[PDB]
Enzyme design. Structure first.
Site: not given
Length: 115
Positions: A39-40
């Site tokens: 998702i970062d």
């Protein structure tokens, strides 16, 4: 009483299901923040904004930069206080030589989808 594993594992996992919308049971201490989440630091930044609120743990950017995995995202907490003055909940092969996985085979047998 204090922030335990299931706390940063179940407590966060739940939150993760809010930001990243990922499953609770899916989230594990074997995560890599990205390598897994994928998702970062975007969503992850939120999950923290919550965990660091819901409870009030200390995990600022100054630390969010180091935090690589849950074990690290946890230690940074407990460690800050005083729980397991060893490394964290996962380490199992020398401190410095941390490896929250416990590999035991080979890789390079994965693929991809791509648009």
């Amino acid at each position: 009483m204090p922030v335990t594993q299931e706390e940063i594992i179940a407590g966060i996992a739940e939150i993760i299901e809010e930001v990243t919308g990922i499953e609770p049971s899916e989230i594990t201490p074997e995560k890599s923040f990205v390598d897994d989440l994928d998702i970062d630091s975007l969503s992850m930044v939120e999950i923290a904004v919550q965990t660091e609120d819901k409870y009030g743990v200390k995990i600022p950017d100054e630390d969010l930069a180091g935090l690589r995995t849950v074990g690290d995202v946890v230690a940074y907490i407990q460690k800050l206080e005083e729980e397991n003055p060893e490394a964290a909940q996962a380490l199992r092969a020398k401190i410095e030589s941390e490896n929250p996985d416990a590999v035991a085979n080979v890789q390079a047998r994965l693929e991809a989808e791509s648009k």
